[PDB]
Amino acid sequence: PAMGGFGLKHPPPMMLIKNTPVPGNITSFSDVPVSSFITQYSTGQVTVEMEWELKKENSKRWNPEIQYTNNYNDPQFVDFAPDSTGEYRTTRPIGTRYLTRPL
Amino acid sequence: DGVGNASGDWHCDSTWMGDRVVTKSTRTWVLPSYNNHQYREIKSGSVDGSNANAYFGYSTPWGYFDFNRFHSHWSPRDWQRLINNYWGFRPRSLRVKIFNIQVKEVTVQDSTTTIANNLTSTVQVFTDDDYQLPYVVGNGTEGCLPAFPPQVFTLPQYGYATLNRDNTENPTERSSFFCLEYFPSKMLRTGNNFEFTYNFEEVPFHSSFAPSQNLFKLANPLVDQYLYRFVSTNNTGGVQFNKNLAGRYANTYKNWFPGPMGRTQGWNLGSGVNRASVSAFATTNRMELEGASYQVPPQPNGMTNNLQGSNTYALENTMIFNSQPANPGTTATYLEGNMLITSESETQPVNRVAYNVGGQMATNNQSSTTAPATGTYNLQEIVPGSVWMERDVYLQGPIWAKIPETGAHFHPSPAMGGFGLKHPPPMMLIKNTPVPGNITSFSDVPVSSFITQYSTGQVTVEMEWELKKENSKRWNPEIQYTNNYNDPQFVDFAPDSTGEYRTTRPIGTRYLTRPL
Amino acid sequence: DGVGNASGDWHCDSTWMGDRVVTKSTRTWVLPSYNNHQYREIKSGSVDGSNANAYFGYSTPWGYFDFNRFHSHWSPRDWQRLINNYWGFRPRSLRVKIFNIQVKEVTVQDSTTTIANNLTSTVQVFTDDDYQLPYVVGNGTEGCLPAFPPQVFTLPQYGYATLNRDNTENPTERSSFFCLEYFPSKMLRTGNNFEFTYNFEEVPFHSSFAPSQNLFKLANPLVDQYLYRFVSTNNTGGVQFNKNLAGRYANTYKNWFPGPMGRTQGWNLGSGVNRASVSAFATTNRMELEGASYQVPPQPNGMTNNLQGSNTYALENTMIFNSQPANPGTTATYLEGNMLITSESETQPVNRVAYNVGGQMATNNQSSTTAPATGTYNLQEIVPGSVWMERDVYLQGPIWAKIPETGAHFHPSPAMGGFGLKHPPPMMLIKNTPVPGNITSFSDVPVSSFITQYSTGQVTVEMEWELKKENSKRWNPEIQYTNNYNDPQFVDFAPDSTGEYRTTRPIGTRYLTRPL
Amino acid sequence: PAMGGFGLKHPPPMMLIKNTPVPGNITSFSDVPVSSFITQYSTGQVTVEMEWELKKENSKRWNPEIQYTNNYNDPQFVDFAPDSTGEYRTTRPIGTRYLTRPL
């Protein structure tokens, strides 16, 4: 895929969810479908557990490598943390290539 | 289990079984929803003209159980039974239980504020068993299980300070954020309960006895020493000696020395004039750290803040409690009449007096032309063959402290008293799981409207303590902690006419004596 | 073992055993001490007016064995036996042996330069089996085992380029240094030997046959197609069709297409006028990479550089060898008479001609007012149902290339021919262990005076190849590679009067034919 | 130890080495010790193999940590590598504390 990631023939199936409808007060019969419902919503918890397999880095480079590091000159707030308002901050995209390999 | 079945029972007790005693306490707690479910980054600059006051940290929406006060486990009367009969004690195990939970939803429509219970809501609970979070429990802060069992308490909010940059409110690239929802926790509905056990690591017994002898006068007052001492020079400069006589303790040779001391200022309580209109801060004992100046009460162990039968107190070497609990952030000026000022006068035979100089020593080299000169010192640290007594534990004081992980420490015994532990009883955190209000459309922006609610429940703590049996051969009767009041107007350690619990005195731990 | 016992024997051979053939080669190598035992950081700026020439890297004091040329394993006559009889072949295994080592010390005192052998000196040897080092072997560079067995060769010095910054000589924070002494190696004294085996990964057979049919004329010339084709519009604009007749290949419907092509410039060899006083570079085919322009011979697979029976060559789609080995860094201007110019004319029935346009196609939309227009193209990449022939292997050419590790590639077959391997025969590095000169005092500064020395020894390579038996039903006789010279003045592929090995022609691999 | 490292009661024993003396041409007897030797030196290889035990980092910090990283603005040469002369370069002391822990 152009946007990155794994391309799958059969990816993690979609999980759909909905609130089962509950009819309001209906006093007479009609062949026309019910259109008045009790308004409602739901909430809950969801847990996702993923196992990932890793490929161990096996280099013979002598000198030290580049690493992703928390480097900020005079931070006004901690990055990747909630600020004074409670809203989560993120000031930079973190890619994936820091280690090197000879071609 | 279910809504109409109770998840646990009430246990308050004390079971003495020889070498052990087991205490049980149950209390009723209430938990507010803190911060409205969110983390906030809290901070401060230089407050009250001191940048040691600056910090940077985080408040969380979690609350925690804190039972690190002796009165949370001991009744006044069991405490008396302990300090009048044993030479020491130490904690062995801990068992905690949270049960009978009830989540209440609060709705304030049209100023009616009705409280209904929500049978389907949860509270999350976990214990930080690997000490991965900032441990805030053993630092003399409020929010512990109350002294008196019928009292209902509010759990305090968990928060912590991390690193600030240059004594300002700003963080550093090393400041850390800990998300507590990033630990595994249990969820409890109204029929559920949480249970947790812990064993303390072998620690030394607290020493609940006072020394019956003075450290500098351990020689037999009937025999002379076979050692001599330099006493002067004759008109020509030749040195002269004199034998150390029997009972002349001012001159005998000593084998052991008193513990470390750092002079503190002494003030008079009750009768006894002090300097008028003083402002303590400017002249208190300080330690520098990262460029800032901090007060360091109660000073390090090894001194005595009071000399028996005297009203002079080295106030900063003292633990000062209030006779009652206070409201948050009070700036009232309390007087001696409101306090429970502790005294360590029963360690004076071994610990130096904090408001006096520690001794003196040679300042020059005498010769036919110069006379020997000496100069006193105000501080003196550890030397080899030094002995002192640790600070005492009070019923209204702290049981343990976590020894900071740094890889290097000396004699891990906390300044405020109690046991110093590498791995102390883990923190137990708790919070009301958030429940969203009516949300009708989708948004990628996080939900910010919740149903307001709170919880309440019971908590039981069960601690096993090991005792060290007193084994004296003293002939005459000892001093004992006793209920002695001249013309009581009310019973102490009991509820008064209003229903509020009274306590007029700090109860330490050293009544029994021992020869050195 | 010992000084007076030989550590191995001489093996040169070829053993044909049906479906397999095993070649063995032994050569004598000499190894100079490179750089005087030290690593140097080598670099270049923009040379010859091209910053694609800039680099940054390291030379090391190691040398390596390179046997990635066919003539290192095949004699001219065994090569002929292979290309006249088989349809394909592929490498199966490799076994290498280094033995009979001799370290020589060289002393030049008073211009006498005497060579003595040093019985106690070592050479270090290792193979990079995990491909942790820059693999420089399959890039058409010199220093392979020689074609002719009696020749003695010098091992080349290992060096590599890493990343340079912005087409300049400077490194980047990603440039890496590899210390080769940081791998485990064997040490060999004059009685020792080194042995190493390897198995190739299943690869496709090389195709050593030429197509006996043209790809666009696979239909039976006797039958018409049951498909029709648009041939015009009548005076009103209505469309008209015509049946595709028998043998009218210019119109039949096709199922398959020729391989990818990128137009290259065509030049005439021998007879055939070219533009006078030209400077190729300015107009050669290029690819940009990191901001620089690189020439890319021999262009990607799928084209033919020559049309059989013609003297026009798409020179940059061609492998050009020299009839003999040259000195390092020669800037001489060779003429056609000195070269061994290869031709891929036997793939013309399937591969497009590199110096011609690749075809044409619709450029507009016809209507009552506009006539259909078409435009030719100069490049065309892969389409589905495309077929082409890979480049041929020559006796004087390369056997394999390492496929670069990037996680994404298409049809890993090297432009220069041969097998593309994920994990190719590991590099074998070798160096003379340094021996310090007379050092009389201590210094923390590394020793810089060494005894000068070199080594020599024998190396044996044993490769097993698998063959694909030719299974034709052609009736008439085939084309074969044959020793045909009109009035020879010397025998080709033999030493001349001087003792130097002659080779006047590149010997490819496609003589046998097959119907498509 | 003030300079850092491990303080040992019984540290890795000292390994001493010397060239055994070889007397020059001595033609007569003397009770006086020989003082003329053949001058010589030695050389060889030395291999040291150390096993180290590690303490695995077990943090619950959320935001990213500080890491030692190869960061140079406009390098003129690779650090911790041989330069054009062949001499090994090192422009910075590399300590050991990058990870953090709550007290």
TrEMBL record, chains A, D:
Signal peptide: none annotated. It comes from the Viruses. It is found in: Virion. Belongs to the parvoviridae capsid protein family. This is Capsid protein. It comes from adeno-associated virus 5.
Automatic annotation (TrEMBL), chains B, C:
It is found in: Virion. One of its GO terms (cellular component) is T=1 icosahedral viral capsid. The keyword Oxidoreductase does not apply. Its main location: virion. The keyword Protein transport does not apply. Keywords: Capsid protein, T=1 icosahedral capsid protein, Virion. Belongs to the parvoviridae capsid protein family. This is Capsid protein. It comes from adeno-associated virus 5. The lineage of its organism: Viruses, Monodnaviria, Shotokuvirae, Cossaviricota, Quintoviricetes. The gene is cap.
